[PDB]
């Protein structure tokens, strides 16, 4: 019997809304050390992978590894029915036909017990074949999201140039072009505004903006994002969590 009592429903709502658009049907694996769920989009170039360790939760009674066939649209509809003062708890019996979600308010008030039906997506559980990335950069997430937004406004193909320790985005469209050249920044006052490039290998890669527009949606969970780039290995965008991550795996178009 799984019983994952959170600390605040906004955490899980943002966790889901970070990737509820790219993918739509996932398998949440409630194992004995938290929750882990990976999926791939229909275009098969984007792989979402989420890990919420047991530390992020408040209570965890799951004693047997269970699987939940979540449909992200219905679950987002359910999560939109949550307040900002509720301790959402996900309960599931031995053989789960449906999942129970309770947004019991801290002060004694109306408990919100929703029963969401589950499916069996019968998919495979995947994992990245790891490799030493050519450059593991860290960058404030809001700035990255703004950069992707204003660049994708121009064209539909964003390029990244990691050379000589200056992260560079370029986009060459029909109405013109746009080139952002941010230097590696570091400061003691604002730790979020920190950009430390790696001179391991120069990286010149171009990704489709139609996928970065979905990557940048999970920009609220992590105040800063870690982008790992390699000319052969597929790029990774890691949004760090309190006890996990919401990392995306994207492959440059070719």
Partner 1 sequence: KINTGSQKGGLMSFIKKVEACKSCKGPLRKGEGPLCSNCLARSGELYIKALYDVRDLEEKYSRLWTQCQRCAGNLHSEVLCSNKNCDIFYMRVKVKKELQEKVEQLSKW
Chain residues binding partner 1 by CB under 8 A are: 25, 27, 29, 31-32, 36, 40, 44-47, 64-67, 121-129, 233-234, 249-254
In the bound state with partner 1, the residue whose beta carbon lies nearer, of 9 and 229, is: 229
Q: Any residues with CB less than 8 A from the CB of 173 and at least 6 apart, and which?
A: 154, 155, 156
In the bound state with partner 1, the residue whose beta carbon lies nearer, of 82 and 252, is: 252
CA angle 108, 109, 115 (to 5 degrees): 120
Backbone angles phi, psi at 49, to 5 degrees: -145, 115
CA angle 245, 73, 153 (to 5 degrees): 70
Q: Are 49 and 94 in contact (CB under 8 A)?
A: no
Pairing relation of β-strands 46-53 and 244-250?
antiparallel
In the bound state with partner 1, the residue whose beta carbon lies nearer, of 93 and 223, is: 93
CA angle 38, 43, 49 (to 5 degrees): 15
In the bound state with partner 1, the residue whose beta carbon lies nearer, of 36 and 216, is: 36
Q: How is the beta sheet containing 166-172 ordered, strand by strand?
A: 177-182, 166-172, 157-163, 203-208
- Residue whose structure tokens are 């593991």: 136
In the bound state with partner 1, the residue whose beta carbon lies nearer, of 25 and 186, is: 25
Q: How far is the CB of 16 from partner 1 (least distance, A)?
A: 19
Q: How far is the CB of 64 from partner 1 (least distance, A)?
A: 6
Q: How far is the CB of 113 from partner 1 (least distance, A)?
A: 26
In the bound state with partner 1, the residue whose beta carbon lies nearer, of 140 and 234, is: 234
Q: How far is the CB of 162 from partner 1 (least distance, A)?
A: 19
Q: How far is the CB of 110 from partner 1 (least distance, A)?
A: 35
Q: How far is the CB of 8 from partner 1 (least distance, A)?
A: 26
Q: Is 24 helix (H, G, I), strand (E, B) or coil?
A: coil
Token pair listed for 82: 């949550």
**Burial class, 68, CB count within 10 angstroms (exposed 0-12 / middle 13-18 / buried 19+):** buried
């Amino acid at each position: 019997m799984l019983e994952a009592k959170f600390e605040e429903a906004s955490l899980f709502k943002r966790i889901i809304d970070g990737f509820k658009d790219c993918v739509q049907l996932v398998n949440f694996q409630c194992k004995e050390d938290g929750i882990i769920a990976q999926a791939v989009d229909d275009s098969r170039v984007l792989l979402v992978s989420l890990e919420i360790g047991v530390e992020a939760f408040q209570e965890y009674r799951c004693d047997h590894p269970v699987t939940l066939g979540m449909d992200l649209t219905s679950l987002s509809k359910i999560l939109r029915c949550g307040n900002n003062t509720d301790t959402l708890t996900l309960i599931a019996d031995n053989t789960p036909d449906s999942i129970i979600l309770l947004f019991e308010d801290t002060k004694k008030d109306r408990i919100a017990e929703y029963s969401l039906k589950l499916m069996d997506i019968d998919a495979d559980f995947l994992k990245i074949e790891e490799l030493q990335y050519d450059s593991t950069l860290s960058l404030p997430s809001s700035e990255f999201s703004k950069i992707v937004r204003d660049l994708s406004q121009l064209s539909d193909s964003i390029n990244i140039m990691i050379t000589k320790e200056t992260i560079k985005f370029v986009a060459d469209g029909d109405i013109g072009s746009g080139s952002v050249i941010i230097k590696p920044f570091v400061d003691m006052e604002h730790p979020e505004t920190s950009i430390k490039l790696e001179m391991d290998q120069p990286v010149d890669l171009t990704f489709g903006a139609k996928y970065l527009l979905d990557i940048i949606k999970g920009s609220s969970l992590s105040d800063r994002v870690g982008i790992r780039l390699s000319s052969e290995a597929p790029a990774l965008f890691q949004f760090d969590l309190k006890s996990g991550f919401l990392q995306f795996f994207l492959a440059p178009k070719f």
